[PDB]
Design a protein around this ligand. Structure first.
Ligand SMILES: Cc1cccc(O)c1
Ligand SMILES: Cc1cccc(O)c1
Ligand SMILES: Cc1cccc(O)c1
Ligand SMILES: Cc1cccc(O)c1
Ligand SMILES: Cc1cccc(O)c1
Ligand SMILES: Cc1cccc(O)c1
Ligand SMILES: [Zn+2]
Ligand SMILES: [Zn+2]
Lengths: 28, 21, 29, 21, 21, 30, 28, 21, 29, 21, 30, 21
């Protein structure tokens, strides 16, 4: 659950960091 | 995975940049 | 274009929730 | 892509599900 | 409550749909 | 406490998404 | 846009309303 | 609706309080 | 610590909302 | 600072107002 | 205007991330 | 200021870092 909440922030961070090229996300 | 690497310990923007396409 | 950046921010959270354990591929272009 | 489909009009979760892995 | 259910364990979206109107 | 408060923040976003046009009711305690 | 704005609205409500909670009904 | 009332024009925190139950 | 980062993220949104035109300062340490 | 005050126990919006300019 | 309000909302999250430990000031006026 | 510079067109994170103290 904490990791699920963290993941939510992670993907936003990835979004901002990666910009135009986008990104790949998976919690493996 | 990214969840284990970046939610248990803190990741830098540079580490996150590995996951860009 | 700023509106598309703003939309994208919400899209990726929607994807995160919908796609769950599978994860997702995000490509603006 | 997703920006074309879902930023110009409101996609449902089922539509968004198309872009999952 | 929704907090008691979904902040202790992870709810599915179908479970979350129970709180829709 | 904090993470309950933080968690509810994410719940309301999720409900907004899930419920779309239908809308929803949020009452934390109960 | 309105759709995106409502997402910020509900977060504002969550925060303003505290333990009272709130009803979100986008056509009432 | 709240969306028409608060997304077209900016709502004060007092106006948002109306929608709390 | 990650929890702290997560809390600060919510704090700045709340400050944005509450402070309005005045704006705010976020200085964690 | 804000972190010690508000990330340990929950702050009201009126306590968060202490960090407005 | 609400479109500026909404953009600002995202801006401060972006600032939070990039600034980290250092923090930032945010004043929409100037 | 930042609103006029970054809400009209997209600012990168590198550019936004100039607003950190
Ligand atoms: C930016 C960010 C968000 C969530 C977890 C992290 O390690 C880093
Ligand atoms: C849920 C969501 C977010 C962003 C765009 C959409 O069409 C739908
Ligand atoms: C915050 C959140 C979102 C989705 C499911 C959950 O159990 C919790
Ligand atoms: C606080 C807030 C958020 C979004 C729209 C509004 O009118 C007010
Ligand atoms: C509104 C809010 C967010 C994060 C921490 C707090 O104490 C309060
Ligand atoms: C990251 C971000 C948010 C909002 C506007 C911008 O130009 C950039
Ligand atoms: Zn937004
Ligand atoms: Zn969070």
């Amino acid at each position: 659950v904490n990791q699920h909440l963290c993941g939510s922030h992670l993907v936003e961070a990835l979004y901002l960091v990666c910009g135009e090229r986008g990104f790949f996300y998976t919690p493996k | 995975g990214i969840v284990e690497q970046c939610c248990t310990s803190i990741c830098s923007l540079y580490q996150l940049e590995n996951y860009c396409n």
